[PDB]
Amino acid sequence: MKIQTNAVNVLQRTSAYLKSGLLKETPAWYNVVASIPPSTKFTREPRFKNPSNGHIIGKLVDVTEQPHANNKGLYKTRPNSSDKRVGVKRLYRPPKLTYVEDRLRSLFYKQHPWELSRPKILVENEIGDENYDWSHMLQIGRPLDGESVIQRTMYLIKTKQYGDMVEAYDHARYEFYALRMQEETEQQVALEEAEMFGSLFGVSAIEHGIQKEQEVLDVWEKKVVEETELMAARTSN
Amino acid sequence: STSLWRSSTQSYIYGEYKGIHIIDLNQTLSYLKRAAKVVEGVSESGGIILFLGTRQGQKRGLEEAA
Amino acid sequence: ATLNQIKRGSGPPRRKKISTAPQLDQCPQRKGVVLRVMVLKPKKPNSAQRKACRVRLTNGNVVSAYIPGEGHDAQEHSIVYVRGGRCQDLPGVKYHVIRGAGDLSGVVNRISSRSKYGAKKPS
Amino acid sequence: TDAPPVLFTVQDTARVITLNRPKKLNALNAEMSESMFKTLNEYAKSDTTNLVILKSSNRPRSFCAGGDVATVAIFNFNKEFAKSIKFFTDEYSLNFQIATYLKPIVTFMDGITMGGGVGLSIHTPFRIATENTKWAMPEMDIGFFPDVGSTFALPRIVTLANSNSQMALYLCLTGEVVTGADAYMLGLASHYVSSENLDALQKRLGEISPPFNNDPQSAYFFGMVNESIDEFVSPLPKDYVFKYSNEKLNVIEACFNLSKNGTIEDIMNNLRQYEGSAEGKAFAQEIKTKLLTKSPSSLQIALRLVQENSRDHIESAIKRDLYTAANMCMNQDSLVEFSEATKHKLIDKQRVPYPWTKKEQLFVSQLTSITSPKPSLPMSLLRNTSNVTWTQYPYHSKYQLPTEQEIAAYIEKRTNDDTGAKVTEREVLNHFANVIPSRRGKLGIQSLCKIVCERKCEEVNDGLRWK
Amino acid sequence: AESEPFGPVDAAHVLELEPAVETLRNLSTVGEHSSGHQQSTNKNTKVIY
Amino acid sequence: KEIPRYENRTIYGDIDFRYHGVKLHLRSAKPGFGLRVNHVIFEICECAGIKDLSGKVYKSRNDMNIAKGTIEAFTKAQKTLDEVALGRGKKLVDVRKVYYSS
Amino acid sequence: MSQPLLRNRSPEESELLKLKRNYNRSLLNFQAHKKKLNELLNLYHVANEFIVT
Amino acid sequence: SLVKLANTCAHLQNCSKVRVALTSIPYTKLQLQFAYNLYQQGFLSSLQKGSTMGPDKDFVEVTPDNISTRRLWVGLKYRDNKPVLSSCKLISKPNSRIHLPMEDMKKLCSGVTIRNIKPLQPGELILVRAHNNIMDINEAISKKLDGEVLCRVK
Amino acid sequence: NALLEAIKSRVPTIAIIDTDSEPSLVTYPIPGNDDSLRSVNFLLGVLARAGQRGLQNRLARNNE
RNA sequence: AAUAUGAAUUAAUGCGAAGUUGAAAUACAGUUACCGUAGGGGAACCUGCGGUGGGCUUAUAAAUAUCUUAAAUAUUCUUACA
RNA sequence: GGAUUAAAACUAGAGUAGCGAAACGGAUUCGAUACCCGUGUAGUUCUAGUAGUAAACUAUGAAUACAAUUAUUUAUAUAUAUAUAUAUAAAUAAUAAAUGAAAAUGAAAGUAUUCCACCUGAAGAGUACGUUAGCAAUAAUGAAACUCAAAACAAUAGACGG
RNA sequence: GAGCGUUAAUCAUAAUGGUUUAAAGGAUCCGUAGAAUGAAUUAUAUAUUAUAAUUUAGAGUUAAUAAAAUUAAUUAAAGAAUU
Ligand SMILES: [K+]
Ligand SMILES: [K+]
Ligand SMILES: [K+]
Ligand SMILES: [K+]
Ligand SMILES: [K+]
Ligand SMILES: [K+]
Ligand SMILES: [K+]
Ligand SMILES: [Mg+2]
Ligand SMILES: [Mg+2]
Ligand SMILES: [Mg+2]
Ligand SMILES: [Mg+2]
Ligand SMILES: [Mg+2]
Ligand SMILES: [Mg+2]
Ligand SMILES: [Mg+2]
Ligand SMILES: [Mg+2]
Ligand SMILES: [Mg+2]
Ligand SMILES: [Mg+2]
Ligand SMILES: [Mg+2]
Ligand SMILES: [Mg+2]
Ligand SMILES: [Mg+2]
Ligand SMILES: [Mg+2]
Ligand SMILES: [Mg+2]
Ligand SMILES: [Mg+2]
Ligand SMILES: [Mg+2]
Ligand SMILES: [Mg+2]
Ligand SMILES: [Mg+2]
Ligand SMILES: [Mg+2]
Ligand SMILES: [Mg+2]
Ligand SMILES: [Mg+2]
Ligand SMILES: [Mg+2]
Ligand SMILES: [Mg+2]
């Protein structure tokens, strides 16, 4: 769509109405808009750095910067065809934001598929309030989950306790297993202790599933019978 | 979605992530402050402010804003 | 056209009116002798008995000239003067005879626009 | 062929001046000052330039680490006193032009702003600070005085503990470095904008223009510039805590409260006889230590100027700095050690303080001579396109955080109103955050008002009294 | 340039004409009783009677 | 709409505007030159307050499209001296006006 | 603006450039030559299965 | 090359229509002189040497090793929702070059159509090349130079 | 429809501009997600309170 | 030999009115039209061969859908809580 | 200037199933030199030639520089937690801008540059005459007079449609 | 207006043009002339041109590596059906 002119120049068109006398009374917005001018450039802006990984955009490595031989054993003595194509488009294309943590996140849930079954709430509370010390995995305010492992791994590599990401990741994974085992026992024991003091429960999870399956299996019984009678008659033909 | 991009918004985009364009909140904040000052000015001047929103669920916000 | 095509002759056609009285040979009028007086039928949607005359000009060209005015005394062998101007509804009649010249008299009892019909001023 | 020391560029209707001496931290020499002074006169005559933006090309490393005094020291050692007086006539004349400039000037203090750098920003009502800002006046350690009209600005713009120029004297005599948010809260910076947002702000400044039939020199346009910057301000860091606690503010307000004929010894007495909290007592000893490692002559000269340029008009204060600078490079009475100290620290790298020799107490007449024009050396400030003088900045107050004297005036007025109402801290915060048009929603304004009431006001019943 | 001064005399040079003030002054010395009226540069043509 | 006018009498410079099939060539004129343009343009200039103008219409001479094209040309094809000066950061001087100034 | 638009290669720079370019051409010729001999060796190993008599 | 200059003039018009803030042009002496005149006249915000990928942040000496990858990067200006550089056209064309004496250049700047060249309009820049230097026509008239009328920018 | 009528009627307009929305159609665009009720209500709330402060400042100047 | 003139003699074509013999074209025009070419026929036209769309893009479903605290809790909330 | 150039046609010699101008018959019809049916010659096939014409069409000459997006394929390259992911070109589809009488075009029918071909109301006419080429059919080149104020394109609303 | 009209003529009155669909892209490509057009840097000259040197972005040559099995001409074969 064409860059519109009439929406941002309401003040100038209105001023012509007032100066000529076509409009007798100044509108209430008139003074406010005059003091706060609209932005009217609507230009495309170049960008020279990917904010996520700090990669520089718009830099060409000259042959003088590649004095040594390549992986093929050949020296570079002239620009290649790619170096001779103008790359202005890269300055204007929104950069693809990338994060190392994304790679670890995909790994964690590939190694632990059932962690996906633990519901996650994507609704944020207040990102600005998060005061986390990742020297430990547990934090007040957030659940224990895969993200706890990833942030712990980053802290280890950031503090240089471990050098390889794999080693830091494995170290964090074991801390995660220990915390998961203490919670699996606290829940089992809490249920056992409550039943031993006379706690009664209406429906268990297993019972809930049986009831839901019965509702479905009852509708399925009717349809099967109906469709095993239309077939018999239709086949009789 | 980046597939639905209207390239005239290029200057507002911070980047693309998970198949969508990420809006630059630093610009959103500056634009928001400017827009807020306009509303305050018109309100303090006695002008008529109309809030238009026709997507489901917006009525409650629209009524209280008015 | 390209610049070189213009150099080779390409250009806008010229606008200049073309001659509609070629038989006069670029003369205001030419004398002639009436070969045969005739009556012709206008092309549609007009209806009338238009008086014309075939004339042999002093240059050998034979033309058809319209006799204007109400009533004429033109006959065969009458000396007439022919000027340019076609009769729109008569195809092929591209000339006019001048009233009040040669043997063609002026329109009888003409009051208005006398100069166009060879009529002298009444005392 | 060489890169110009200062680069001038067009930003729509804004003219950008960029300091281009990265290797020297943008130090200001006579060449830089002269270029900027001449180009600003042209921009003042131009009808297509709405505002000017003074920035650096080295940000966030430094904006201006100070005037080039190391070169002035070599001049003194070579008796090139004419060269030295040219360096100060150019710099001080540029500081006077900026102070009286009729069009908005917006300085981006994105980095070390010390010495001459302070002169480039302190005199502009739009002096923007960032997280990387480092404001300081480290002249007492080099044997010089607080120059670039800092003795006329600081006593008039500081916000806290500056009723009698106590805080102004603390910064000028101790050379304490203030960083980012603290500079904004003290009044050293009019605005606080994140460095990342400076590019966007610069573009917006170039795009705004006076409306209808208003020139860029009208107060209306100055309001527009202030609003434009405010749209780019962001809330202070959550963890941020003001640098000076009330107890530390009480030490400065008492230990640096002198009379019209006070002396550095009087301050030393207060710092040595201070009584109060343990933090205050310990804080007073720290100041005493620092003030005893400075030049004994510079401290006395600084106090003289602060007590002289705090009630005089701008032109006489800047002119008195030119006289003092010239009367110091040419040490006729061997009363100062500016040249020797400058070589000990800058020309030669020596962490240890220069051993001082002029450790006497200059008399009132001696100080008068050092700060008065010699009838043999005629020096005058270059003429600017405004040629105006005044005793109060025409715009600084409107666009910076309020001072402790402005809050007091409203409490006294409100407390003495026919309404017979009670002044409450909540009412004070509302009156400064949601009433004054130019201060509406100003960053860290409620925090400053609460610091003032908690230290200056007495809460009796549902009212406030100005202790 | 944005701060370059341009005045009537500069305009006169651009238009290759005498300054407008000069034209006014030369038009005031035309009256027979006006100051500056002079006519002698033409008395250089040999005539014989 | 408001149309820019140079000295409230003419247009700023020359205009070559294409409105659909209408080719409009409008030239600014000296004071006292009068309106020497297509009759449709003449009426518009009279109402708008343009006194001096020269021009020629090529290709389509449809009255309706000449009128709309002219209005569009006066707004979208003109730039005031002030707007040019501010955009380029330069001073633009009218030599004829300075010649008769003090 | 004052900077020269182009700086000609110094005679030394042209010498080092020629060395690298000659090396590049020579290395590719050698690598192709050795590949052909390695294919001739692998064909000798199987020529006992081929019939010529 | 006048062909290259025609390519650049058309390129700048295309960039103005889409309102890109930064674009590149071929790296040649004529192109650099052309761009520099536009920069000094206020049509271009910035003029930087660079490569095919973008403007250089630090000085990069140009040599035969990298000449093929060099470009000039120019910043376009837009004010009040209008491009400052709206049109850019050649006067002297590759197939019909126009050389004018200083007398005829003065007539062109005075409202007279010379050799079908429409006269200079208010706020328009006409560039002239003389002895391989590019200057404004008004500057050539000041220096009494005769030269080729290259292009007009508005 | 409403935006075009506002232009025709010279009424200044504010709108949330998502990545698929035309910025030039409004006087004061606010770049932001327009599909989430939280994002919309957050931006609307800020604008509404700004209006409230203006209203309170107008009613206060009338009292005093 | 050329140029010009007249010329026995002979070819093509336009307009005008105005009937006649069919109904070729424009809709699927009642056999899709037209292009090139060939043969045939009172006349339009018919037929063969290839080509073109300035005709068929005029294009529009074999249907089937799911479990966590329904509320003393969400739904209320007006600058409050924190 | 040169070369190649569908179908038909022609020259010479082979071939000839099927198809099929023509011709001769059968039907249909008021008539049927047609549409449909039969018998079916040239031709359609091969070899060696002649000829250089088609709605030979994208009814859009070639080259270069340049300009906002999406989708889908293809290719090359890169990476790995090995099958995707990231790049750079090409093709196609739908578009922004721009252009346009509009229909629409969309990387051109946009912004520019260079070179070639071609056009200047309809009808007469791609005709007449001459010339050149060909075995021939023909092909190329290519007018004027007379007459008229017309003639044409895109789109709009109708009417009508076996 | 002592002229007016009319006829015959001259100038002006749109190329600050067009060719998918309205007049108009050559069937196609190859290539000669072109008094057609056409890269970069530097130095001279008598200067948008000339000359010299230098350069590699257009245009080409060879090889390496990978990919593809089409388009011409020719020769040798196969297949369903038809009569
Ligand atoms: K038919
Ligand atoms: K046919
Ligand atoms: K046929
Ligand atoms: K056969
Ligand atoms: K076709
Ligand atoms: K061609
Ligand atoms: K067309
Ligand atoms: Mg009559
Ligand atoms: Mg949305
Ligand atoms: Mg029939
Ligand atoms: Mg029919
Ligand atoms: Mg039919
Ligand atoms: Mg037949
Ligand atoms: Mg057929
Ligand atoms: Mg049809
Ligand atoms: Mg169709
Ligand atoms: Mg045969
Ligand atoms: Mg048959
Ligand atoms: Mg042939
Ligand atoms: Mg033919
Ligand atoms: Mg043909
Ligand atoms: Mg074909
Ligand atoms: Mg080719
Ligand atoms: Mg023929
Ligand atoms: Mg039609
Ligand atoms: Mg007379
Ligand atoms: Mg003409
Ligand atoms: Mg064309
Ligand atoms: Mg073709
Ligand atoms: Mg054709
Ligand atoms: Mg190549």
Side-chain angles (χ1 to χ4, degrees), chain H:
Chain H
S1 166
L2 289 191
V3 170
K4 282 191 195 293
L5 191 60
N7 293 356
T8 290
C9 302
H11 181 57
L12 297 179
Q13 290 187 160
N14 299 345
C15 291
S16 290
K17 287 289 185 181
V18 294
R19 300 211 191 172
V20 289
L22 182 70
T23 203
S24 71
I25 65 178
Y27 177 84
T28 80
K29 187 185 176 193
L30 190 68
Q31 297 286 347
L32 180 54
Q33 289 184 137
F34 169 75
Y36 191 64
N37 283 260
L38 297 202
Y39 176 86
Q40 292 198 297
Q41 296 289 349
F43 288 102
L44 299 180
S45 64
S46 69
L47 173 58
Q48 303 170 266
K49 291 182 179 171
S51 70
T52 52
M53 305 310 165
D56 289 333
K57 307 180 185 172
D58 301 352
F59 166 79
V60 175
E61 184 148 38
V62 179
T63 76
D65 300 284
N66 65 2
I67 187 59
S68 70
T69 65
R70 295 305 91 185
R71 298 288 293 188
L72 286 167
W73 292 87
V74 294
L76 302 171
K77 300 171 65 177
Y78 308 86
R79 196 182 172 272
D80 298 359
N81 212 5
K82 290 175 182 184
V84 174
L85 172 63
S86 58
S87 58
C88 184
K89 182 193 171 180
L90 293 179
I91 291 163
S92 167
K93 284 182 181 184
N95 73 345
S96 51
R97 312 220 168 173
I98 303 177
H99 292 82
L100 296 186
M102 186 264 291
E103 305 88 76
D104 292 342
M105 290 180 182
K106 287 181 60 177
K107 295 180 198 178
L108 199 59
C109 299
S110 297
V112 179
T113 296
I114 301 301
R115 286 191 61 187
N116 193 30
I117 306 160
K118 291 172 167 179
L120 181 66
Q121 299 304 304
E124 177 172 43
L125 169 66
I126 290 175
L127 294 181
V128 170
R129 192 173 54 185
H131 277 221
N132 297 314
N133 299 318
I134 286 188
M135 56 191 71
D136 174 30
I137 189 163
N138 297 279
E139 175 171 30
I141 295 174
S142 295
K143 301 174 174 179
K144 311 294 183 175
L145 304 165
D146 302 6
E148 189 179 74
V149 181
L150 278 183
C151 61
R152 59 199 311 153
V153 164
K154 189 167 51 177

Side-chain angles (χ1 to χ4, degrees), chain D residues 58-302:
Chain D
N58 187 26
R59 81 186 193 88
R61 174 165 154 243
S62 65
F63 164 65
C64 177
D68 204 9
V69 303
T71 64
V72 169
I74 301 305
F75 296 172
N76 301 357
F77 296 126
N78 306 353
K79 277 36 180 171
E80 305 167 0
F81 302 117
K83 289 190 183 178
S84 298
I85 295 166
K86 183 187 166 59
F87 167 99
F88 289 114
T89 301
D90 292 358
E91 171 174 29
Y92 297 173
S93 295
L94 182 69
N95 290 325
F96 186 59
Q97 186 188 30
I98 291 166
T100 59
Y101 210 75
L102 305 191
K103 289 183 192 172
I105 298 186
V106 182
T107 308
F108 293 171
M109 299 179 320
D110 198 305
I112 299 159
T113 303
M114 292 176 191
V118 176
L120 289 184
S121 53
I122 206 76
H123 295 288
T124 61
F126 303 116
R127 48 200 183 292
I128 308 181
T130 74
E131 64 276 348
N132 313 304
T133 294
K134 298 171 190 62
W135 183 105
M137 282 310 243
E139 294 83 37
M140 300 303 98
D141 280 343
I142 301 295
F144 209 60
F145 73 103
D147 64 308
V148 303
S150 62
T151 52
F152 174 100
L154 296 198
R156 291 182 173 79
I157 73 165
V158 173
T159 61
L160 294 182
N162 194 67
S163 304
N164 191 7
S165 310
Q166 302 104 329
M167 185 70 198
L169 284 163
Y170 169 66
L171 296 173
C172 292
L173 297 176
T174 310
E176 180 57 21
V177 178
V178 189
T179 58
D182 302 305
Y184 169 66
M185 286 294 288
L186 281 175
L188 304 175
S190 62
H191 293 81
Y192 187 70
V193 172
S194 66
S195 64
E196 302 97 324
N197 276 337
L198 289 191
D199 181 5
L201 177 63
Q202 182 173 325
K203 292 200 207 180
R204 171 69 177 177
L205 288 173
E207 297 167 59
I208 57 174
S209 302
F212 316 133
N213 189 64
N214 304 304
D215 65 356
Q217 300 181 358
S218 68
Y220 184 108
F221 187 59
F222 274 76
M224 287 184 54
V225 170
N226 175 79
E227 180 61 18
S228 292
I229 301 159
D230 284 332
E231 299 159 341
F232 288 96
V233 172
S234 289
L236 289 175
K238 294 202 175 187
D239 290 344
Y240 164 80
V241 176
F242 186 53
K243 164 184 197 173
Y244 302 116
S245 61
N246 285 4
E247 291 186 0
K248 294 187 164 185
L249 293 186
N250 287 326
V251 171
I252 290 156
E253 191 157 30
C255 298
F256 291 73
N257 183 307
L258 296 192
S259 70
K260 192 171 182 182
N261 305 64
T263 73
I264 297 296
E265 188 59 58
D266 300 359
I267 295 170
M268 284 289 308
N269 296 359
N270 304 358
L271 284 165
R272 176 173 46 255
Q273 308 151 5
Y274 176 71
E275 53 190 27
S277 172
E279 171 182 2
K281 196 175 183 183
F283 181 56
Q285 302 308 310
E286 167 183 353
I287 302 183
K288 183 186 171 186
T289 297
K290 296 179 182 177
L291 294 182
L292 289 170
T293 65
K294 307 303 184 184
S295 179
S297 56
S298 76
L299 291 181
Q300 295 190 300
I301 296 170

